[PDB]
């Protein structure tokens, strides 16, 4: 799980993306349970209501 | 007691699938576990488990 | 820690009612269920008991409930037992095998099925004497109207006042200040003597 | 003279601890003997390598073979029972002229017993090698592996 | 309940037998805990019906004797010896010295 | 050495063993062949497991004085490992090992708190 | 993937990485090449998440492309504990719990169990069976120095309940020694040693 | 013994008390039917321990007066408490506040200091030579 | 917050079991176990939104 | 505290048994029918009990090596329970158990300090 510690959710436009993954340089979308790329009209509002404006990595989530 | 690992001419450890042709051999190249080698992946863990499997009965 | 149950009026009533239900148990084809979404307990000696009875004959259920309630208040003072009786809606002079005001009030739950659904439940403070625990029960029965009677009688018995066990032990924090002061004053008296 | 007092008290502590330990051992030697006897396996665990215990005295061929095809299996020979097969060839028996002939087992259990028994009974019959070549047998062996 | 219908091939059953097979009542004991976080000092027990029949004894149990044995064979905090030694230490450190 | 190991593991192993005995006695209700050796595939190896009659605990064919006889597989589909496991069931079944108290008293570890292991919860819910 | 122009390429492309979102969205078009490719994929890797999604996709229209796959898997991994509903471990009885009999084993007809491990006939017969039982289900149980006890004795039996068996008294009553006697010996021997040392010196 | 052997034996001896509810009189069966209570759930030879029963009789007696009551808890988290989910639906009464005491076969640890202290302690004695 | 589809999100309560010796995370959701391999890209892309949307 | 309390159990039992003996002596005056076996109904079960001629303590029909025989009742009025209690009175009456010290030396408890129990309920009722 060490390589995933810098992964933070941050969505451009309405498509949920995952940043901070080093071995996958291209922007990798976020998949759902049925392995569908996540497109959400209110992604920014959801992220703000989850942690706030500032991005949160996986390391901060694990240290909660 | 000192443990050593069988390697080929390129200092790549011989897999277990060749054990039958290593026991019958007499001039096997061996690398001693005392000296650390960073080129072999997981050498420290392998030497650790080699030393640990000695002490089954004791 | 295996501790005894601290017997209390509503607990005695519930246990007597459950025993009477068990000794008149009859098979039935109705499905009776308990569904609790969340159970949260964070206080010590807060025992939780989820007993799932269900008797389809609700008339006999109220009969046994009133009988158990009468046997419970057989030890209370006369004025208190009587006033609690009118508060609940049960009259002692009436035979338990009769429809009372409480049953009439709780018949409004006849249409709904005999299922106990709690979205979220949390156990409050449970002050008990040492060696004993305060036990809370969630009892289901074969009719929601018998359940209505059950919780209303339980609340009425909870309305009484039982003196609480008070904790006199001070909160504990690691006391390095005392040993530090002791060392400092030992040095002080060493200097004074010298 | 504080140093002398400190030395005396620490040496007295050492001697007194020695005597206490001696008397406790004298009274509890039997007790610790049965405690160790009934808890002998608790001294050293058999997972010193971080892996489950393995008895090297009991030999298993599957520990070293990393190739499936090299392993010996029992396969259903169509219309002639069961045979023992591997990438090397079928397990055979001596023929009329000290040749190799595929030996055939009536039941899966008999084939398993013969193949995996401790007795060394390996007789390679390669149907794809030059001295003994059979197109149908070689095709079946290659297909069933 | 028929042993014949308990191992037959479902493809060769008539429609009526298929439905009758589908409309059986099956008893079901299971006391399942999907997720459990049990630490060193806690314990969990499960049962349905006779799933705990072997933990009950037909003969009566003298639980008083069980507690008496649990107290007899148990660690003894020697408060009498400790108090006597503490008193001796205090007397020696204050009066004797 | 023994006192420290016992303090660390004995009571936790006993509680876990009682829990799994209850679980397996619930599981054995209505099944008659659960007390017979079946070759269970654990991904990388096979193990000849049954359910112990007396304790209703998982039981496996043992390898000498070590742990269970884990027949390693050279791929996902290994007929040879399956057949050797069946051979063990028929022949080498006289020596068995049980999870929990017996494994702790024979090998020094219970197997319930080591992963991967055929007694552990993670390897059985995976 | 609304037209079959990419079928030929994706057929070979998705065997390497069957979990790719593009491969699953190609499967979701529900054409024969996609379903057959994933049937061949899942006959060997039926214990992978993309095979759960494949089963969710095909059923109930094209269950025949999953069942076959399952069969192959459960005839190769007969030792898998998850193929023990579709392929019962008993040698003679492999079809023991096929069809409406799937509900005779309450482990097969469980909500926690994934439906990719049952044939479609077992899947449709899973919800229409009657269970006159008496069950306790707890989704989560975090114990912190607690003693939970989940008993359900439910069919009418003898009312009286026997006392729990206490085990056997393994510990033996050995002949002990006085508690103060070790302390007495220690003090006496220390005093005697000191007295002899003082006298001889 | 197998079911066929059971049938053959009980047809050989149809008056044996051991097999009397596997082949009961039609009177008993129709009394049970007309009471809405199957005979095998209350008729005494069925309850007998030594009575021999076939598979069908056993799997039908196992469903005698069985109730259908379920408890479905969610995320339970208790600390320093006791949880007692009874789900009891029969005449049997759960033994409330019945302290279940077992034999605590406690193993007494002894005050044995690790004998690695033996050299160091000797060193302690040695420092008396500093006071000479 | 768990996305049951591309555009649908639902609040859920999950349990996580991590085994770092083999590198796998088992997520109990709705009573069902989902095994995610930490060495798989798709499993990572599915699990990470679940972890990073926790509260 | 637990050790001290379990130690004091014996003295508490002696005192309560003796006081109950005094109250039994006081109660059994002018009533010869209380000295014979009667089927006392406890709301849920019948017990065939009397007062011992020597110790003047409640003495009931014993069930094997256990406590007093409790004829379970299936209803408020259960004729069968009364009939069976009478049957025990007339046939199986040679095995008896007495509250107090015999109760303590046989089953481990005194009968008193236990609620509900036939000794305590009979002392409270009578």
Swiss-Prot record, chain D:
Coiled-coil segments: none
Broad class of the protein's primary localization: virion
Post-translational modification: Contains two intramolecular disulfide bonds. They are created by the viral disulfide bond formation pathway, a poxvirus-specific pathway that operates on the cytoplasmic side of the MV membranes.
Record topological domains on the Virion surface side: 21-145
Function: Envelope protein required for virus entry into host cell and for cell-cell fusion (syncytium formation).
Biological process (GO), any one: symbiont entry into host cell
Record lineage: Viruses, Varidnaviria, Bamfordvirae, Nucleocytoviricota, Pokkesviricetes
Highest taxon in the source lineage: Viruses
Subcellular location: Virion membrane
Name of this chain's protein: Envelope protein OPG155
GO CC aspect terms: membrane; viral envelope; virion membrane
Transmembrane segments: 1-20
Organism: Vaccinia virus (strain Western Reserve) (VACV)
Pfam families to which the protein is assigned, alphabetical: Pox_A28
Expression induction or repression: Expressed in the late phase of the viral replicative cycle.
Bilayer topology term: Single-pass type III membrane protein
Family designation: Belongs to the orthopoxvirus OPG155 protein family.
Known partners and oligomeric status: Part of a stable entry-fusion complex (EFC) which is at least composed of proteins OPG143, OPG147, OPG155, OPG086, OPG094, OPG107, OPG104, and OPG099. Formation of the viral membrane is necessary for the assembly of the complex. Interacts directly with protein OPG107.
Gene: OPG155
Sorted UniProt keywords: Disulfide bond, Fusion of virus membrane with host membrane, Late protein, Membrane, Phosphoprotein, Signal-anchor, Transmembrane, Transmembrane helix, Viral envelope protein, Viral penetration into host cytoplasm, Virion, Virus entry into host cell
UniProtKB/Swiss-Prot annotation, chains F, J:
Mode of membrane association: Single-pass type III membrane protein
Signal peptide per UniProt: none
A GO CC annotation given for this chain: virion membrane
Keywords (A to Z) from UniProt: Disulfide bond, Fusion of virus membrane with host cell membrane, Fusion of virus membrane with host membrane, Host endoplasmic reticulum, Host membrane, Late protein, Membrane, Signal-anchor, Transmembrane, Transmembrane helix, Viral envelope protein, Viral penetration into host cytoplasm, Virion, Virus entry into host cell
Effect annotated for changing residue 108 to E: Complete loss of interaction with OPG155
Virion surface side: 1-126
Highest taxon of source: Viruses
Keyword Lipoprotein: no
PTM note: Contains two intramolecular disulfide bonds. They are created by the viral disulfide bond formation pathway, a poxvirus-specific pathway that operates on the cytoplasmic side of the MV membranes.
Compartment annotation: Virion membrane; Host endoplasmic reticulum membrane
Impact after mutating residue 107 to E: Complete loss of interaction with OPG155
Consequence of changing residue 111 to E: Complete loss of interaction with OPG155
BP-aspect Gene Ontology terms: fusion of virus membrane with host plasma membrane; symbiont entry into host cell
Keyword Membrane: yes
Chief location of this protein within or outside the cell: virion
Family named by the database record: Belongs to the orthopoxvirus OPG107 family.
Primary role: Envelope protein part of the entry-fusion complex responsible for the virus membrane fusion with host cell membrane during virus entry. Also plays a role in cell-cell fusion (syncytium formation).
Protein name as it appears in the record: Protein OPG107
Species of origin: Vaccinia virus (strain Western Reserve) (VACV)
Lineage: Viruses, Varidnaviria, Bamfordvirae, Nucleocytoviricota, Pokkesviricetes
Full-sequence range covered: 64 to 189 of 189
From Swiss-Prot, chain H:
Domain of life: Viruses
Annotated GO CC locations: membrane; viral envelope; virion membrane
GO biological process: fusion of virus membrane with host plasma membrane; symbiont entry into host cell
Transmembrane spans: 112-132
Keywords: Fusion of virus membrane with host cell membrane, Fusion of virus membrane with host membrane, Membrane, Signal-anchor, Transmembrane, Transmembrane helix, Viral envelope protein, Viral penetration into host cytoplasm, Virion, Virus entry into host cell
InterPro entries per record: Pox_virus_G9/A16
Entry keyword Cell inner membrane: no
Localization annotation: Virion membrane
Function summary: Envelope protein part of the entry-fusion complex responsible for the virus membrane fusion with host cell membrane during virus entry. Also plays a role in cell-cell fusion (syncytium formation).
Name of this protein: Protein OPG104
Gene: OPG104
Swiss-Prot record, chain I:
Virion surface side: 1-55
Subcellular location: Virion membrane
Post-translational modification: Unglycosylated because produced in viral factories instead of the classic ER -Golgi route.
Induction conditions: Expressed in the late phase of the viral replicative cycle.
Family according to the record: Belongs to the orthopoxvirus OPG086 family.
Known role: Component of the entry fusion complex (EFC), which consists of 11 proteins. During cell infection, this complex mediates entry of the virion core into the host cytoplasm by a two-step mechanism consisting of lipid mixing of the viral and cellular membranes and subsequent pore formation.
Self-association state and partner proteins as the record states: Interacts with OPG099/L5. Component of the entry fusion complex (EFC) composed of OPG053/F9, OPG076/O3, OPG086/G3, OPG094/G9, OPG095/L1, OPG099/L5, OPG107/H2, OPG143/A16, OPG104/J5, OPG147/A21 and OPG155/A28. Except for OPG095/L1 and OPG053/F9, each of the EFC proteins is required for assembly or stability of the complex.
Record-given protein name: Entry-fusion complex protein OPG086
Species of the source: Vaccinia virus (strain Western Reserve) (VACV)
Lineage: Viruses, Varidnaviria, Bamfordvirae, Nucleocytoviricota, Pokkesviricetes
Residue window of the full protein shown: 57 to 111 of 111
């Amino acid at each position: 799980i060490d390589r995933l510690r810098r992964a933070n959710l941050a969505c451009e436009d309405d498509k949920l993306m995952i940043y901070g993954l080093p071995w996958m340089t291209t922007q990798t979308s976020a998949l759902s349970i049925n392995s569908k790329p996540i497109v959400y009209k209110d992604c920014a509002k959801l992220l703000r209501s989850i942690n706030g404006s500032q991005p949160v990595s996986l390391n901060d989530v694990l240290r909660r | 007691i000192k443990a050593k690992v069988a390697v080929d001419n390129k200092n790549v450890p011989i897999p277990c699938s060749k054990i039958n042709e290593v026991n019958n051999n007499k001039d096997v190249d061996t690398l001693y576990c005392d000296k650390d080698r960073d080129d072999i992946p997981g050498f420290a863990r392998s030497c650790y488990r080699a030393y640990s499997d000695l002490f089954f009965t004791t | 820690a295996e501790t005894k149950e601290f017997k209390t009026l509503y607990n005695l009533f519930i246990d007597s009612y459950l025993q009477k239900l068990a000794q008149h148990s009859i098979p039935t084809n109705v499905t009776c269920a308990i569904h609790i979404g969340e159970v949260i307990g964070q206080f010590k000696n807060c025992a939780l008991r989820i007993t799932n009875k269900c008797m389809s004959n609700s008339r006999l259920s109220f009969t046994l409930m009133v009988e158990s309630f009468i046997e419970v208040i057989s030890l209370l003072p006369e004025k208190d037992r009587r006033r609690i009786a009118e508060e609940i809606g049960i009259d002692l002079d009436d035979v338990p095998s009769a429809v009372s005001k409480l049953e009439k009030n709780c018949n409004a739950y006849a249409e709904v099925n005999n299922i106990i659904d709690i979205q979220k439940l949390d156990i409050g403070e449970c002050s008990a004497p040492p060696g004993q625990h305060m036990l809370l029960q969630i009892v289901n029965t074969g009719s929601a109207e018998a359940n209505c009677g059950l919780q209303t009688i339980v609340k009425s018995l909870n309305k009484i006042y039982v003196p609480p066990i008070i904790e006199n032990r001070l909160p504990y924090y690691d006391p390095w200040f005392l040993v530090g002061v002791a060392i400092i004053l030992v040095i002080f008296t060493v200097a004074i003597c010298s | 003279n504080s140093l002398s007092i400190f030395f005396i008290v620490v040496a007295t502590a050492a001697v007194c601890l020695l005597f206490i330990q001696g008397y406790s051992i004298y009274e509890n030697y039997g007790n610790i003997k049965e405690f160790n006897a009934t808890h002998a396996a608790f001294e050293y665990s058999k997972s010193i390598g971080g892996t489950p215990a393995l008895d090297r005295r009991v030999q298993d061929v599957n520990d070293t073979i990393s190739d499936v095809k090299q392993k010996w299996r029992c396969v259903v020979y169509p219309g002639n029972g069961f045979v023992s097969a591997s990438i090397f060839g079928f397990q055979a028996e001596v023929g009329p002229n000290n040749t190799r002939s595929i030996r055939k087992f009536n039941t899966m259990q008999q084939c398993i017993d013969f193949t995996f028994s401790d007795v060394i009974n390996i007789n390679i019959y390669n149907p794809c090698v030059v001295p003994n070549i059979n197109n149908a047998e070689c095709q079946f062996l290659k297909s069933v592996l | 309940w028929d042993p014949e219908c308990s191992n037959a091939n479902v493809n060769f059953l008539l429609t009526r037998n298929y439905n009758n097979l589908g409309l059986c009542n099956i008893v079901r004991c299971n006391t399942s805990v999907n997720n459990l976080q049990m630490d060193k000092t806690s314990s969990l027990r499960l049962s349905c019906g006779l799933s705990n029949s072997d933990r009950f004894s037909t003969v009566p149990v003298n639980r008083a004797k069980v507690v008496q044995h649990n107290i007899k064979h148990s660690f003894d905090l020697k408060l009498h010896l400790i108090s006597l030694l503490s008193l001796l230490v205090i007397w020696i450190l204050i009066v004797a010295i | 050495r023994i006192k420290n190991t016992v303090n660390d593991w004995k009571s936790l192993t006993d509680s876990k063993t009682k829990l799994e005995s209850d679980r397996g006695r619930l599981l054995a209700a209505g099944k008659d062949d659960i007390f017979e050796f079946k070759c269970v595939d654990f991904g990388a190896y096979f193990i000849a497991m049954r359910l112990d009659k007396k304790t209703y605990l998982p039981q496996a064919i043992r390898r000498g004085t070590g742990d269970a006889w884990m027949v390693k597989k050279a791929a996902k589909v290994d007929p040879s490992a399956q057949q050797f496991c069946q051979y063990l069931i028929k022949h080498k079944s006289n020596n068995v090992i049980t999870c929990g108290n017996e494994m702790l008293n024979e090998l020094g570890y219970s197997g319930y708190f080591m992963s991967p292991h055929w007694c552990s919860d993670f390897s059985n819910m995976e | 993937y609304k037209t079959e122009h990419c079928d030929d390429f994706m057929t070979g492309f998705c065997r390497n990485d069957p979990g790719n979102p593009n491969c699953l969205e190609w499967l979701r078009a529900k054409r024969k090449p996609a379903m057959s490719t994933y049937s061949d994929i899942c006959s060997k890797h039926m214990d992978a998440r993309y095979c759960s999604e494949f089963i969710r996709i095909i059923r109930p229209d094209y269950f025949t492309f999953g069942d076959t796959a399952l069969y192959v898997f459960c005839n190769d991994h007969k030792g898998n504990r998850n193929c023990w509903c579709a392929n019962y471990p008993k040698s003679n009885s492999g079809d023991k719990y096929l069809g409406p009999r799937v509900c005779w084993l309450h482990e097969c007809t469980d909500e926690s169990r994934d439906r990719k491990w049952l044939y479609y006939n077992q899947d449709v017969q899973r919800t229409r069976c009657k269970y006159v039982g008496c069950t306790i289900n707890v989704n989560s149980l975090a114990l912190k120095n607690s003693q939970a006890e989940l008993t359900s004795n439910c069919t009418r039996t003898t009312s009286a309940v026997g006392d729990v068996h206490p085990g056997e008294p393994v510990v033996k009553d050995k002949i002990k020694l006085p508690t103060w006697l070790g302390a007495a010996i220690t003090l006496v021997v220390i005093s005697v040693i000191f007295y002899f040392i003082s006298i001889y010196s | 013994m197998t079911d066929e052997q059971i049938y053959a034996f009980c047809d050989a001896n149809k008056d044996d008390i051991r097999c009397k509810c596997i082949y009961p009189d039609k009177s008993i069966v129709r009394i049970g039917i007309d009471t809405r209570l199957p005979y095998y759930c209350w008729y005494e030879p069925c309850k007998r321990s030594d009575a021999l029963l076939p598979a069908s009789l056993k799997k039908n007696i196992t469903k005698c007066n069985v109730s259908d009551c379920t408890i479905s808890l969610g995320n339970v988290s208790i600390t320093d408490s006791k949880l007692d989910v009874n789900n009891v639906c029969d005449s049997k009464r759960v033994a409330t506040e019945n302290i279940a005491v077992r034999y605590l076969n406690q193993e007494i640890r002894y005050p044995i200091i690790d004998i690695k202290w033996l050299p160091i302690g000797l060193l302690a004695l040695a420092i008396l030579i500093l006071a000479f | 917050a768990i996305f049951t589809d591309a555009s649908t999100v639902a609040s859920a309560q999950i349990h996580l079991y991590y085994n770092s010796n083999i590198g796998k995370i088992i997520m109990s959701l709705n009573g069902k176990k989902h095994t995610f391999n930490l060495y798989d890209d798709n499993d990572i892309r599915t699990l990470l939104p679940i972890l990073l949307l926790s509260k």
